[PDB]
Amino acid sequence: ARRTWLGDILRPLNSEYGKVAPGWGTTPLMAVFMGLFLVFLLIILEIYNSTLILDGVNVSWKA
Amino acid sequence: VFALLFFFGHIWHGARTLFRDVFSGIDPELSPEQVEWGFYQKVGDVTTRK
Amino acid sequence: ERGWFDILDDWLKRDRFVFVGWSGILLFPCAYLALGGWLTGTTFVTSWYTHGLASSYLEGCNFLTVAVSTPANSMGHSLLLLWGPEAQGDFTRWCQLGGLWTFIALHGAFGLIGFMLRQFEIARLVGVRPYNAIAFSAPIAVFVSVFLIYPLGQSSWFFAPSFGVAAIFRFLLFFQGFHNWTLNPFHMMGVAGVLGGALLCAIHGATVENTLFQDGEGASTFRAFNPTQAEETYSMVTANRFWSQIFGIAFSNKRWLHFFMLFVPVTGLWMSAIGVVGLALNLRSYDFISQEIRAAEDPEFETFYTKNLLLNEGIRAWMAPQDQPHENFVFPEEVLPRGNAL
Amino acid sequence: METITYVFIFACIIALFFFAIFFREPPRIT
Amino acid sequence: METITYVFIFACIIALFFFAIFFREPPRITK
Amino acid sequence: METLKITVYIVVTFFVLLFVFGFLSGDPARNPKRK
Amino acid sequence: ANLWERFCNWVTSTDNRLYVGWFGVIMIPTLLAATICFVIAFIAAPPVDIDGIREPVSGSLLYGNNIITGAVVPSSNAIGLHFYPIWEAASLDEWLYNGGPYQLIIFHFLLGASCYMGRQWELSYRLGMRPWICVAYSAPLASAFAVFLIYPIGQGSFSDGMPLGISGTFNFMIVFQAEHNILMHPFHQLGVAGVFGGALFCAMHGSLVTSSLIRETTETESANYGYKFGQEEETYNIVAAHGYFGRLIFQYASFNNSRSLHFFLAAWPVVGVWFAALGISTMAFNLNGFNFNHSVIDAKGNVINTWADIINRANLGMEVMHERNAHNFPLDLA
Amino acid sequence: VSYPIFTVRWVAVHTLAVPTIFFLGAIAAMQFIQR
Amino acid sequence: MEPNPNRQPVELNRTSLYLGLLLILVLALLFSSYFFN
Amino acid sequence: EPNPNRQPVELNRTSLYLGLLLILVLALLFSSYFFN
Amino acid sequence: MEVNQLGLIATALFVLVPSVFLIILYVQTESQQK
Amino acid sequence: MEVNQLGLIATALFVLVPSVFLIILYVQTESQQK
Amino acid sequence: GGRIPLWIVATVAGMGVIVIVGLFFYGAYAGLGSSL
Amino acid sequence: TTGERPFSDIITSVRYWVIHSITIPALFIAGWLFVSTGLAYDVFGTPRPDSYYAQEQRSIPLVTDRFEAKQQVETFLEQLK
Amino acid sequence: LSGLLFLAACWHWVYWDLELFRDPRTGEPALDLPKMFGIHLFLAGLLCFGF
Amino acid sequence: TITPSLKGFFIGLLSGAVVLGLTFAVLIAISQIDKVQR
Ligand code: CLA
Ligand code: CLA
Ligand code: CLA
Ligand SMILES: CC(C)=CCC/C(C)=C/CC/C(C)=C/CC/C(C)=C/CC/C(C)=C/CC/C(C)=C/CC/C(C)=C/CC/C(C)=C/CC/C(C)=C/CC1=CC(=O)C(C)=C(C)C1=O
Ligand SMILES: CCCCCCCCCCCCCCCC(=O)OC[C@H](COP(=O)(O)OC[C@@H](O)CO)OC(=O)CCCCCCCCCCCCCCC
Ligand SMILES: CC1=C(/C=C/C(C)=C/C=C/C(C)=C/C=C/C=C(C)/C=C/C=C(C)/C=C/C2=C(C)CCCC2(C)C)C(C)(C)CCC1
Ligand SMILES: CCCCCCCCCCCCO[C@@H]1O[C@H](CO)[C@@H](O[C@H]2O[C@H](CO)[C@@H](O)[C@H](O)[C@H]2O)[C@H](O)[C@H]1O
Ligand SMILES: CCCCCCCCCCCCO[C@@H]1O[C@H](CO)[C@@H](O[C@H]2O[C@H](CO)[C@@H](O)[C@H](O)[C@H]2O)[C@H](O)[C@H]1O
Ligand SMILES: CCCCCCCCCCCCO[C@@H]1O[C@H](CO)[C@@H](O[C@H]2O[C@H](CO)[C@@H](O)[C@H](O)[C@H]2O)[C@H](O)[C@H]1O
Ligand SMILES: CCCCCCCS[C@@H]1O[C@H](CO)[C@@H](O)[C@H](O)[C@H]1O
Ligand SMILES: [Cl-]
Ligand SMILES: [Cl-]
Ligand SMILES: [Fe+2]
Ligand SMILES: [Mg+2]
């Protein structure tokens, strides 16, 4: 393989192939963010759908 | 239209990923015990032989 | 095993009469509710307030005429949740507003996702390639295009198909009179993949049954087979020669043959789905402009294409006032298109 | 020009039928 | 349509110049 | 039209006669097993 | 041997690239005649007075059609079921105006396709095969007979035969709906189950076999190379496929017997399509789909519409518009 | 030998069988409704 | 100059050519009417 | 048994480039007259 | 018939471009060492 | 500009047909056992 | 372990299906849905 | 061969029938009564044969207001009595 | 932009065998996808924010 | 304000959490009580 100046500089950023944290690691915090993101999407969908109607939120061209 | 077609591309590549080991076909020595009912207590798990 | 996740995984994946799996948690309740919602509505629930129609055994409909009908056009594309702003938790009103429609459509959509996740999960446990799940994308593309995308492109769920035998017939005839959907080349490719798939289903079953090896003494030949046997049960060589000489070509590769049997109907359904996405926008193959320019200037020029648009025009004028009640159409007798006498 | 195009495609398909039958890859046992 | 056609042909020619020079069959002394 | 009709009548008779005599020419024997 | 004997030997040879056979002696000329007449008419035929009211319909490419609108147009309603060969006409020009090519094509085609079916029996016998592939083909063949011969006979006219064309076909479908309410007929419903289920089981079988192919190739090669024409060993694991499908649904819902499986694959579409064909062939004699028009009535006697009545309104639109200059009296009785 | 009574299968069967019979009783009654 | 070891030959067998020409020509026979409109 | 008159055919890379140059430059020359 | 003037070229290329793609791939397969 | 309506198809085929002929020949030369 | 023969269970069960579906057909001609 | 008691064992056993010769008929009768009492109409909001139209009313009680459709149906229903 | 990207593509096609793309432990081609995701996600976050 | 549809939103959300919560409670409990033998 060919070394270049830029390749030498970037080498550390492509040197941890396969490296894992032990076990479940941060999986539970991930799940919490996924849940909150599900709820966020449900909210924005229900607002656009007029299923969730909020004070001062007039979903229309005209305010 | 392209969104719907990309659903197929997702299903296809997700499949290729999770099933890389059988891409050319299934084990030629696949144990008939692994597909028959009640040999294992847990589908596809040799350690749960009943 | 290990922790609770792995003990749950164990139990979920037990080898039992009805396999469960992680997918089962999504599949089972959604499929159950979609099916029970259908049987519930068709047995007991009206469409008087949404369509001006009776639609249940309770009202006197039969298995052909019952349906769970779509919500009124004024509902727009409301999710129409039991607890939403329309029904406000009143189960009776929710039924009368068409809430069972979006109930069935949405649980049904999640159930199909769960079913296809089922096909992936079982394939992985048994160690087979997941082509069955892949083939099932065609049912998903159809369900999603027709029951979700189509009405989402139109004014409301009212124009989605209603869940019933006669209701679906009505949906076909609407698509003919309003979209000229038979003219559409994505529908034509659908039809080719359906009829060509049915053709391949029949011809491959008949060929195997008629090139069988004599593997028993019985004149009923089904017993002369063993799932575990090494050997092909029928002669590929003889089947190849037969069709080569009858039709001019034949399969010679069994693997290709079976992949082609996946390919044809799956591809045809996917093509029909694309045409329906276009119909969501009224982006139809309705006309050939060259035909219309000629026929407008030449009153002696007639083709089967011009004949069919006359039929469409009849369908629209005669069916619209009752089929689209929110429009309050009143079409005085004198304006209805009719040929002579009829 | 359109009639020509439609008949041209059709003629190519009939030619294709001819090569696919009589100049197929011949099936060989084993 | 004509302008597109002429510019297309011209563009293909320039692309050819690039391949003919940088992706030529390299001259080699039979050695 | 008269000539055409007579021609077609002859052609059809000719082919029908091949079919009938053909199938009369020991057809059951023309198989790979018991003759 | 004598000339006749050698001829017979050639006609029945298992060695001809295309099998000829005695059925083939009729099939070859009749199919060739129908094909040639069809191609020439589809390109060049002038307009045809399908409904016998001097209103000629243009079917051919040179007279302003495309592949989708073009047809060979059915013979004139004035003809009815009368046999209209070329020599019955005063001229080719008259023959063409009255839709002679349609009769020529469909009679030669039906005879030729019936011989195609016989020929399938014939070759299977020459090859020492079991004989019923020809019974599977009877289903599409019955359906062709229904739309090109039985229906016209019932209604008294080849002008009500299915046109030989893509848009013509849809015309026939739509008029058939107005006149018979075919969608509401259980034999057409069984045909739908036959073709949708045939598609379904086609995809199912393709996918189950494909899913259990035995590894015989590397990741660079098509797996199709893992099978060699004529090999003795089965190329997939049916016990694996059954293992999968029995779990997808439940064990006894899946076949582990390939013979039973392939019989089912033959039977389901063939039977459904036989009912499709018999649906058309019995609506030919006007035994029509279920009629629940105004079936639901309230306590006073108000009609409470159902989806059946909405169908009826679409049917009425088709009925009142179709053949808009051909009816003089109030009932369309054929 | 000695079988469990209540299984996932048992539950599957009754989620379907139970409303089915109830519905069939409802629909039988309906056949005697007059307008 | 060094050869890339990832290169692979490509194939299209005769049947595949015929199947593909059939797909293309039949698709063209179907879509051409719409293109002329 | 095979026809011994058969021969392989070749078009080297330089000839491809020469040829495509000929074709494109002739098209660039003639297209004006085609459109007229 | 007043057809779209681009129908012809659209149809021509629709056939030619992928047909030629396939022909190129077929011929170079045949020319690979027997 | 009111150009000849066949000039586009003529030019395209003029380019495409011989170019494709040369591409077919070149690629099947490259794929020959070297 | 059996005591009632399967063929009896099937015959009674089948007859029960026929009765209830017969009733449903009867109802197509009487009361609601009868057109009368 | 997944463990559970074979169905054909269960449905030919005296005990299965002792339980079900009561549960099956009881469910069927409860379904019957759900209709014969009229209860089905009120749970689901389905009109009785005398409740589709008021005596002289011309048109259908079609819902035309997304957010007050519930109130519309309620008003439509008093306008019968 | 199109022109410059085309030229870069040529460079990357010819000079494909860069040491940067080789796993330093095995000498096999390797891309550390999890870390590439954070790098690209960070950049995308930066661009989104600045937009 | 909490509009009547935001209150419905919370009720839907609560209901879903409960169906899921109880579903997972029951499944976990049953998996614990009924372990595969290894
Ligand atoms: C038929 C639908 C379907 C199927 C069968 C699959 C199948 C697959 N997915 Mg894909 N996926 C889908 C749709 C689907 N997906 C959709 C719509 C998205 C969102 C864009 C994704 C996003 C996605 C990602 C990002 C990944 C997968 C991956 C996978 C693979 C592993 C299984 C998995 O992760 O499941 C995912 C689970 C589901 C699809 C079920 C979700 C059920 C939701 C939570 C129910 C929500 C209920 C809702 C809140 C109710 C309110 C409704 C509202 C309208 C009111 C497998 C190939 C992974 C992969 O390929 O690994 C190699 C992977 O990384 N999926
Ligand atoms: C996996 C099973 C499953 C899935 C995917 C669905 C999916 C759906 N159901 Mg169905 N349902 C189920 C099982 C399921 N159901 C069961 C078992 C029953 C019997 C009880 C029902 C009975 C039912 C009814 C009666 C209705 C639905 C409806 C719906 C739809 C809207 C659901 C919603 O908005 O939830 C929102 C909730 C969630 C997405 C849960 C999110 C969990 C997050 C991650 C945590 C929440 C914690 C939270 C912060 C704490 C409480 C909130 C606090 C602020 C107050 C959607 C299609 C409605 C519909 O079809 O309308 C047309 C409807 O009316 N379902
Ligand atoms: C030769 C006649 C013919 C043929 C073969 C077809 C074939 C087709 N038609 Mg066309 N049609 C025709 C004539 C025909 N049509 C004519 C003359 C018209 C008048 C214009 C139409 C109008 C028409 C419309 C309006 C539509 C079609 C559609 C289709 C496709 C339906 C695919 C399918 O299976 O959906 C069936 C549904 C699915 C596959 C979704 C998933 C289903 C799940 C898996 C069901 C699970 C059920 C569960 C297990 C239990 C059920 C409970 C039980 C009690 C029922 C298919 C390509 C549809 C299409 O294009 O969709 C994109 C469509 O919307 N047709
Ligand atoms: C939130 C909460 C509550 C969560 C709890 C979830 C949970 C854990 C639940 C557990 C409890 C539970 C299971 C409850 C059940 C709920 C319930 C009843 C849900 C309803 C499910 C439902 C509606 C299912 C639909 C029914 C269904 C799938 C019917 C299939 C019908 C059908 C046609 C089957 C095919 C049968 C047949 C003859 C097939 C042959 C045709 C075929 C496939 C040929 C191809 C082929 C076949 C082969 O055979 C092999 C070999 C090969 C080669 C091959 O080519
Ligand atoms: C007669 C033998 C020849 C037929 C074999 C060829 C297969 C033909 C296919 C027949 C069509 C299917 C009918 C099978 C019927 C059949 O042919 O065999 C009958 C079979 C044999 O009974 P046994 O008493 O031997 O039962 C043994 C098992 O119960 C022991 O675990 O019993 C059943 O499986 C039917 C009961 C279904 C119970 C329904 C449970 C609810 C589950 C719902 C969820 C399912 C999951 C789907 C969504 C994921
Ligand atoms: C909706 C809803 C829900 C649910 C419900 C459910 C889940 C239900 C279920 C239900 C069910 C689950 C029902 C069932 C029924 C059934 C029936 C009604 C049946 C019938 C049958 C028959 C009638 C038969 C027929 C036949 C056939 C099919 C073939 C053979 C012959 C004969 C004809 C016999 C909830 C609460 C969550 C909430 C809200 C809403
Ligand atoms: C318009 C319809 C015509 C009506 C004809 C009525 C037929 C009734 C009389 C039948 C007489 C024909 O008799 C039949 O003729 C044929 C043709 O020569 C004979 O000759 C044949 O014999 C053997 C039999 O294996 C064949 O292989 C051989 O090719 C052929 O020469 C049959 O062995 C003989 O049985
Ligand atoms: C206007 C429409 C245009 C569409 C144009 C389509 C372009 C298609 C390009 C296909 C290129 C195939 O590319 C070609 O691959 C083959 C193998 O397949 C390579 O061939 C290589 O492997 C083969 C087979 O082992 C050896 O015999 C050969 O010595 C070796 O060089 C060629 O070196 C390469 O040039
Ligand atoms: C619209 C425009 C379309 C224009 C179409 C132009 C088509 C031109 C076809 C070119 C045909 C080349 O024909 C091809 O010749 C090569 C050699 O060159 C043959 O190949 C033969 O020789 C080579 C090299 O010694 C061997 O490796 C190979 O095993 C052998 O069969 C192919 O078997 C044949 O298919
Ligand atoms: C709904 C399932 C998705 C959540 C999966 C995250 C697992 S979380 C994980 O769980 C283990 C038991 O399995 C514990 O031993 C461990 O401490 C814990 O961190
Ligand atoms: Cl008409
Ligand atoms: Cl008349
Ligand atoms: Fe098969
Ligand atoms: Mg009744």
Side-chain angles (χ1 to χ4, degrees), chain G residues 66-69 220-221 225, chain I residues 8 11 13 29-30 33-34:
Chain G
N66 60 31
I67 293 282
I68 305 297
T69 64
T220 64
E221 288 282 319
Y225 288 116
Chain I
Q8 292 275 342
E11 66 157 83
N13 64 27
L29 195 63
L30 166 62
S33 293
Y34 303 90

Side-chain angles (χ1 to χ4, degrees), chain C residues 282-303:
Chain C
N282 296 327
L283 207 47
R284 298 149 176 176
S285 307
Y286 190 87
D287 50 10
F288 289 119
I289 296 183
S290 65
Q291 293 276 303
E292 301 296 3
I293 285 173
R294 173 68 182 279
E297 285 162 4
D298 179 1
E300 283 176 298
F301 179 75
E302 176 162 36
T303 62

